[PDB]
Amino acid sequence: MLKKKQLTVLDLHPGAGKTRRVLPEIVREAIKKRLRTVILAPTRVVAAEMEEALRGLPVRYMTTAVNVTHSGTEIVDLMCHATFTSRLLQPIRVPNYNLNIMDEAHFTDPSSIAARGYISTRVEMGEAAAIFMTATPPGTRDAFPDSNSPIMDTEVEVPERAWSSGFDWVTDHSGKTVWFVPSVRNGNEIAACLTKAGKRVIQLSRKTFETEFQKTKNQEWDFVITTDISEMGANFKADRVIDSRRCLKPVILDGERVILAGPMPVTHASAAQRRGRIGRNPNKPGDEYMYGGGCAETDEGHAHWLEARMLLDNIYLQDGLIASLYRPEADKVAAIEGEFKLRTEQRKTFVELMKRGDLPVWLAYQVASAGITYTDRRWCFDGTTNNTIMEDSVPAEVWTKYGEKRVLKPRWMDARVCSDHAALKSFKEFAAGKR
């Protein structure tokens, strides 16, 4: 599969050994053939596991998840999906890799969709080879794939709020459970309910993943409450998955604002990945998968696909050519290639609002396309009254860089900036001119 002009989809079931068995073999072949290679990890936890499986081989780790001394003789680079897309957007020159390997190639974050589109366009052009590793490739309709050991699948009503009665099967369990919830706020309520009942609970989310995931290997626990971030390679020594089968979906209303719609059904790929956390030990059959709803294709019209088109329109490919999205996922957005292409100064602002500002892609695009400079924060305060960000049922207030107290009322409203305490705290600092 290491011949140019070819994209291979390695669709082995979860736990088949794509990362620890197949990946080192591919890397050995690539090094033997002198192919300049990139290995793309979804998260820093998967990058650290990749280092363990590739230990010894000459790989340059362009991540702070690994403390390795690079010898300067490596032709294989390893970085996160976001780092690849980030360096492509920045004026830093990215080598034209002969071989592009993406682990967990089902990841639906905007930068992972943009990386797949850039890589597949290069392959379509006959300029490179690529391998996409995932049990659930884009376009999968099977939520119950094969596993290392048999799994008990059980359709049951799963609590999405705290409960006093009616769900004995949840707490009358003597093993370890991984519970997928649609949001951090929903996870907090369920975790507080389990803690009140004498349970040891760890909570995981996109922002707190690195610190808290370490606790799953450092201490004993009864439950892990996680958002969909644990679908991307996170391993646990658990015997049960409780899956709400629900997710939050960012949606752009009338091209003017972003809302977090739902909770709504997960896609089949997400349900298969969530179920995939268990049934991984062939010596421990009978791990349980309790699911609380059905699947639907909620990736259609999801903002991440539009956001990925905003990223690719501002990545240089060849003269005025623009990368297309990877074909099985190109129908998820009604978009024209090049419609989000920005001029040089606005594009520089767009990059900075994402890289330094930490704003969602859609919100960074609104600000940059309006001709506003990175450091100009007047837009955080001059929106309509219906854009007032609320904190505990009362308007959120910040001290501006001018020393005044103002109501946070952004010109463009993106629900992701105030979806939880940590997101709102970060957006208040941005509005205050603190970064």
Report the binding-site residues.
Answer: 12-19
Q: Which residues are annotated as a binding site for ATP?
A: 12-19
374 binds ligand ZVE (CB under 6 A): no
Q: Taking the alpha carbons of 365, 370, 376, 377 in that order, is the dihedral positive or negative?
A: negative
Of 62 and 424, which CB lies nearer to ligand ZVE in the complex structure? 424
Give the tokens for residue 214: 């370490």
Of 400 and 419, which CB lies nearer to ligand ZVE in the complex structure? 400
200 binds ligand ZVE (CB under 6 A): no
Of 385 and 393, which CB lies nearer to ligand ZVE in the complex structure? 385
402 binds ligand ZVE (CB under 6 A): yes
Q: Rounded to an integer, what distance in angstroms lies between the CA atom of residue 125 and that of residue 210? A: 38
401 binds ligand ZVE (CB under 6 A): yes
Compose the 404-423 pattern: x for residues touching ligand ZVE by CB under 6 A, - for all others. x-------------------
399 binds ligand ZVE (CB under 6 A): no
Q: Which of 60, 381, 419, 424 lies at the binding interface for ligand ZVE (CB under 6 A)?
A: 381
185 binds ligand ZVE (CB under 6 A): no
435 binds ligand ZVE (CB under 6 A): no
Stretch of 14-22, 165-173, 240-248, 394-402 contacting ligand ZVE, by CB under 6 A: 394-402
Stretch of 21-29, 47-55, 208-216, 376-384 contacting ligand ZVE, by CB under 6 A: 376-384
Compose the 125-144 pattern: x for residues touching ligand ZVE by CB under 6 A, - for all others. --------------------
Q: Which of 400, 411, 415, 420 lies at the binding interface for ligand ZVE (CB under 6 A)?
A: 400
Q: Measuring CA to CA, which residue among 98, 73, 71, 100 is closest to residue 84?
A: 100
Of 249 and 377, which CB lies nearer to ligand ZVE in the complex structure? 377
CB of 363 to ligand ZVE, least distance (A): 16
Give the tokens for residue 13: 């079931």
Count the residues of the shown chain that bind ligand ZVE, applying the rule CB under 6 A: 7
CB of 404 to ligand ZVE, least distance (A): 6
CB of 397 to ligand ZVE, least distance (A): 12
Compose the 68-97 pattern: x for residues touching ligand ZVE by CB under 6 A, - for all others. ------------------------------
Q: Which of 141, 378, 421, 434 lies at the binding interface for ligand ZVE (CB under 6 A)?
A: 378
CB of 145 to ligand ZVE, least distance (A): 51
Give the tokens for residue 103: 């682990």
Which residues contact residue 250 at a Cβ distance below 8 angstroms, ignoring those fewer than 6 apart?
Answer: 258, 259, 260, 261, 302, 303, 304, 360, 362, 415, 416
**What's the Cα-to-Cα distance from 120 to each of 88, 116, 125, rounded to whole Å?**
15, 6, 9
25 binds ligand ZVE (CB under 6 A): no
324 binds ligand ZVE (CB under 6 A): no
Q: Rounded to an integer, what distance in angstroms lies between the CA atom of residue 178 and that of residue 224? A: 5
What's the residue count for the chain? 435
Locus of tokens 């240089």 = 316
Give the tokens for residue 115: 């990386």
Q: Measuring CA to CA, which residue among 87, 59, 81 is closest to residue 72?
A: 59
388 binds ligand ZVE (CB under 6 A): no
Which residues contact residue 91 at a Cβ distance below 8 angstroms, ignoring those fewer than 6 apart?
Answer: none
221 binds ligand ZVE (CB under 6 A): no
Of 221 and 381, which CB lies nearer to ligand ZVE in the complex structure? 381
Give the tokens for residue 386: 């219906």
CB of 371 to ligand ZVE, least distance (A): 16
Taking CB atoms, the residue at the shortest distance from ligand ZVE is: 400
Q: Which of 377, 409, 416, 428 lies at the binding interface for ligand ZVE (CB under 6 A)?
A: 377
434 binds ligand ZVE (CB under 6 A): no
Stretch of 45-53, 85-93, 345-353, 400-408 contacting ligand ZVE, by CB under 6 A: 400-408
387 binds ligand ZVE (CB under 6 A): no
Binding site for ligand ZVE (CB under 6 A): 377-378, 381, 400-402, 404
